[PDB]
Amino acid sequence: TYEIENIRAGLEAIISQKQEEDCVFDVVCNLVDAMGEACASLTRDDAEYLLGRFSVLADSVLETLATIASSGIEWTAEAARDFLEGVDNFISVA
Amino acid sequence: DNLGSQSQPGPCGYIYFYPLATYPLREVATLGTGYAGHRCLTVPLLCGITVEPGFSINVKALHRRPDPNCGLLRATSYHRDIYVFHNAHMVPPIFEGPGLEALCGETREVFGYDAYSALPRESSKPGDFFPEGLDPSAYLGAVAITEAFKERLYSGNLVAIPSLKQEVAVGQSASVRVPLYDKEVFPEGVPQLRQFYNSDLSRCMHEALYTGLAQALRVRRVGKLVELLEKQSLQDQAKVAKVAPLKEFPASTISHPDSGALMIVDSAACELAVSYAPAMLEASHETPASLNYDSWPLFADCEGPEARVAALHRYNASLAPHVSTQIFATNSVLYVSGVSKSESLFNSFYMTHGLGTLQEGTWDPCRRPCFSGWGGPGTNGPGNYAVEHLVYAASFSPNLLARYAYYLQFCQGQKSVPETGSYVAGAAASPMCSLCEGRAPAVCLNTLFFRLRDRFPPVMSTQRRDPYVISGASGSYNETDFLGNFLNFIYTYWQLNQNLLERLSRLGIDAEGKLEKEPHGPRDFVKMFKDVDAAVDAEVVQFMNSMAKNNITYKDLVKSCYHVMQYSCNPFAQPACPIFTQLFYRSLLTILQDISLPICMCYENDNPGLGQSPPEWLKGHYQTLCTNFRSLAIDKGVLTAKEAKVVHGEPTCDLPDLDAALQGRVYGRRLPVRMSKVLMLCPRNIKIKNRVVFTGENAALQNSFIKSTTRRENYIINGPYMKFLNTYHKTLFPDTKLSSLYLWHNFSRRRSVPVPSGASAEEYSDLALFVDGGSRAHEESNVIDVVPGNLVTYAKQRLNNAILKACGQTQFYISLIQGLVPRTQSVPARDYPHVLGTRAVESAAAYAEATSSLTATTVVCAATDCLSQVCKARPVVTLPVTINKYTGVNGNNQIFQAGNLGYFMGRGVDRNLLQSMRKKFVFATPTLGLTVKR
Amino acid sequence: NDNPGLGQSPPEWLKGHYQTLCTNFRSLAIDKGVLTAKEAKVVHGEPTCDLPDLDAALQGRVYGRRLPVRMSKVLMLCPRNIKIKNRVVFTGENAALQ
Amino acid sequence: GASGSYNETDFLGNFLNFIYTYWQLNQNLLERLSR
Amino acid sequence: GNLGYFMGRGVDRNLLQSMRKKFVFATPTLGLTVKR
DNA sequence: GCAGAATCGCCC
DNA sequence: AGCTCGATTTTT
Ligand SMILES: [Zn+2]
């Protein structure tokens, strides 16, 4: 395989299993682990390919990666959690 | 009447002279084939940059005077490329890497190919072909040539007449042209040194034009192919066999149980391609609006020369995926290896591919040893694709290889490795490099090859029946909506789609799905969709009423519908790149061979080889086989062409006195004239077909097409609304932390929805029930495997699911075609080392410093959900085809053909192809708003 | 019309052209609305067959031999019918006939 | 000469000869006339 | 092969005088040389 | 690995 | 003096 196929498989494996919590921080940590500093310029066309079946998530991933880039922490999964985790009404339907 | 009859008398070609002080040298270089150290290059023929506005591409060429008082006329179009031969060092190269001319020379010899052999004369001195008084140091010189007399240009048999000069405006530049005439217009003779010859021009044509035509026939003797094409043009030899002696065969053909019949079929297919392809290329062609460079829309916002050059580089990046696909695909037209035998009877002979086969030794038509083969060679390792295979793809031409390398510089790397800067400062700078000596490490061809290494195809020695990949301009009438050519003529399916766009206009939605007013909130989002659903459901009723009152059998017409694409046969319709000349010519020669295979087989079954060699068998049979081909290849389901007679109206015409003009005196005469050829074969289109409906009849296939009905958990997020629920998320749920995917998946499992702080509860309970209701209705009814991105595609999906239900088509998904469309993006130059130029690189820290402030242009492809809107923009296309052949119905015994859309081979082609029966792909780049005005 | 006579006599013109004209006729005369015919290959199953010894029979002596045999011609053109047609309905379109 | 086996020479000729067929329609009428 | 007309007044008295009527001569073979 | 098809034109 | 017709098989 190409390495972009292995990143894509690992993201579809996370998103297909994550339940009872929103997945964007766990997707962003897997990207920052696999690409490091190269996340700082990740384009929407590359992000949509890597997200595969779940390509709808791309805008929220890119908005999240800009907060890591602009807050001046280094590109590692340990620093990404340390920033993100420091930084509702719900009606039921018939 | 016809375009041939209407064309005027004129010369066989022109020499153009452009002033160096004012001519736009950096613009033409972006469209050229220039390498570092060149003495000649090719550029496109274009009105307003290489020829004057109003240039006639069709002419009657005055080519022979049987005596001083009679002229003969040949009807011909121009050749597509212009050859730049005098002061050519003034045009910048397209690619900066050194050493290409020696690399091409070495690689041509190991494959056993013929190099250009110069005439024993010198090249014509400037004072022999320049107009009176012009300084040769002040001008750039180039040839424009007619398609029928280009071998005469190569062979030094044209005469230039400087006294007949004409002054012409080429864009801003005050330019001059001189006419060219065939030496057969001087029956008393002209001295051998009075004829026009340039050795750098003839060598450039040998490499960049004729070598690729020889590769398409599997011939090595390029100079002998040029000689037989010249005699075919001047002495009417189209019905005489001529290429068979030059043929060569591999051990898989020589060892074959049917080898004697295979050698005859392979030879006869090549003879027919050489008879018919030049005739169709020489024919009179329509003049496209894209041929006018000063009306190109892509320049419309540009101010000054830098903006114009940067606009041409963006234009070139939009074409690169077509060029890189023909390098990366295992089944590219550039890697066709020959003919082999099994498949049903008419499919039993077929075209093969493989670079391993192309390296092997060969035998001649008398079964004697011929070429001895090559054992192979770099950084991609043993048995794998090497830089020599890229040189073979480029026809051993440094001009073509330079423009291929320029397109490959737009491609992304895909690692299956040293960091880029430690490769560029490390092994790329070694004095062992046979190209740069380590003195240009960032732009070197070996550095580009190292970067793209894992995308090149495997090297193959097998004989399987696969589709081959073609590139070129599309025709006028494509049928690529969801039901293809269903009810195209008799209301028509085209009119039904026009009616739907009119209803969507009354809702405030345009043809690309843009709104005049975006939805304000939950009520407005529901209201927007319910109006589109009601508008589609109204049009289904009016259509079903029309089919009923006319008793039309629409329920059976759905079963036989096809998607249709037209591949254009006009050479002037192709994009303004010299690589597209070779891709078009080689696609045409390959299609004519593949169409001819069963025609040759049936004639040989009736007239057996009986141990004769193919040149002996063709001597008796070929004249009859030409006439069978003309009757059975055309209008039988792939190729369309129109025969016509060409006539000239006047018995004399106003022409210069060529005997006085040779002595420098200029005045007119009314010379008697007649046509030397009357018949013309005007080519039209090649037609590509794909079947829409699987009928369940072939029991082995059903598991790929079958429609499930059980209630899935993904039904909202893989349903018809998810892309809109994402696009409008910030207006539906102001300042929520939740992703749109998690909000609707939580609803899909827990039945709950968040209500914004001042918003009303029941308004959101309704939004949720709309999404749920339509998603379950779609899960039940849908047979079109698409998640729509815009309201026009959403509407068209709802419409076509209704028609298929009225036809009882409910058990299976339909076939889809998806367009892959180029998107151009600027990225940090860190892994794109060619931005540094011919610069010396001394350390990885200096490479990192020099790239830290720089950006590179790159290209990726995006999948469209709606091919039919791309086909309205008159696209450049690349696609795979197999030509299948079959018997007629109702007791008929004739052979009919279809060109069926196939699949790409090789994992390096595009990441969207990385894993189907029911989805196929085409690459498309639009031309409306780039080179043609809306 | 495509291969003109140019003052040649018909025997001179046929010397070059006739082999091609045979193949045009076979393709354009049959199954085109008047004449129908079926092409077939003829084969013999046994490699030898029971036949009289013709050298002995010429000298008046009668006995059998299993002579080796093969076909001297393989293609056969079986004729079927010639079709005659007559139109039933006048549609009023040709105003001279009404 | 001799005629072939399949001739269509009733008042409407080859009308609906194959797909009920005009031949079958004529066979139905002869059966009613037999009764 | 379109059905046409007979020429010559000696052929048969039934042909002695149209667009809309044509004639064929016919002799049956069932019950003569072939058994019903 | 990865259907089947008698064909042409017409172009709203 | 005397329509127009894209064609084959099927075969009761
Ligand atoms: Zn180098």
mmCIF file of N, CA and C and ligand atoms in Angstrom, chain B residues 98 427-430 433-441 444-447, ligand 1:
data_model
loop_
_atom_site.group_PDB
_atom_site.id
_atom_site.type_symbol
_atom_site.label_atom_id
_atom_site.label_comp_id
_atom_site.label_asym_id
_atom_site.label_seq_id
_atom_site.Cartn_x
_atom_site.Cartn_y
_atom_site.Cartn_z
ATOM 1 N N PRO B 98 19.742 19.255 -17.366
ATOM 2 C CA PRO B 98 20.736 19.045 -18.420
ATOM 3 C C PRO B 98 20.862 17.582 -18.903
ATOM 4 N N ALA B 427 22.965 12.072 -2.479
ATOM 5 C CA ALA B 427 23.197 11.287 -3.698
ATOM 6 C C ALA B 427 22.910 12.010 -5.031
ATOM 7 N N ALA B 428 22.021 13.009 -5.082
ATOM 8 C CA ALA B 428 21.785 13.777 -6.314
ATOM 9 C C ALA B 428 22.993 14.632 -6.757
ATOM 10 N N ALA B 429 23.872 15.020 -5.824
ATOM 11 C CA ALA B 429 25.058 15.849 -6.058
ATOM 12 C C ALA B 429 26.331 15.036 -6.382
ATOM 13 N N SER B 430 26.226 13.710 -6.510
ATOM 14 C CA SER B 430 27.342 12.817 -6.832
ATOM 15 C C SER B 430 27.906 13.062 -8.247
ATOM 16 N N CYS B 433 26.499 11.103 -11.706
ATOM 17 C CA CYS B 433 25.299 11.374 -12.513
ATOM 18 C C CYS B 433 25.688 11.641 -13.986
ATOM 19 N N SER B 434 25.189 10.820 -14.916
ATOM 20 C CA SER B 434 25.427 10.976 -16.365
ATOM 21 C C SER B 434 24.615 12.103 -17.019
ATOM 22 N N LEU B 435 23.867 12.899 -16.246
ATOM 23 C CA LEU B 435 23.032 13.991 -16.749
ATOM 24 C C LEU B 435 23.542 15.370 -16.292
ATOM 25 N N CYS B 436 23.708 15.599 -14.987
ATOM 26 C CA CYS B 436 24.113 16.883 -14.408
ATOM 27 C C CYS B 436 25.555 16.917 -13.867
ATOM 28 N N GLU B 437 26.259 15.781 -13.813
ATOM 29 C CA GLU B 437 27.543 15.619 -13.108
ATOM 30 C C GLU B 437 27.465 16.009 -11.617
ATOM 31 N N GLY B 438 26.266 16.021 -11.024
ATOM 32 C CA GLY B 438 26.011 16.546 -9.690
ATOM 33 C C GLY B 438 25.905 18.077 -9.615
ATOM 34 N N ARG B 439 26.054 18.804 -10.730
ATOM 35 C CA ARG B 439 26.106 20.279 -10.785
ATOM 36 C C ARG B 439 24.741 20.972 -10.975
ATOM 37 N N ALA B 440 23.625 20.236 -11.036
ATOM 38 C CA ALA B 440 22.252 20.780 -11.059
ATOM 39 C C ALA B 440 21.233 19.892 -10.289
ATOM 40 N N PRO B 441 21.488 19.548 -9.013
ATOM 41 C CA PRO B 441 20.855 18.405 -8.362
ATOM 42 C C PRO B 441 19.349 18.556 -8.103
ATOM 43 N N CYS B 444 17.490 18.056 -11.856
ATOM 44 C CA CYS B 444 17.884 16.861 -12.606
ATOM 45 C C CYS B 444 16.727 15.858 -12.790
ATOM 46 N N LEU B 445 16.629 15.263 -13.984
ATOM 47 C CA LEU B 445 15.627 14.257 -14.319
ATOM 48 C C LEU B 445 15.676 13.056 -13.358
ATOM 49 N N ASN B 446 16.858 12.636 -12.904
ATOM 50 C CA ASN B 446 16.994 11.563 -11.919
ATOM 51 C C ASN B 446 16.393 11.935 -10.547
ATOM 52 N N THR B 447 16.396 13.212 -10.164
ATOM 53 C CA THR B 447 15.740 13.701 -8.936
ATOM 54 C C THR B 447 14.220 13.671 -9.068
HETATM 55 ZN ZN ZN H 1 21.950 14.490 -11.927
#
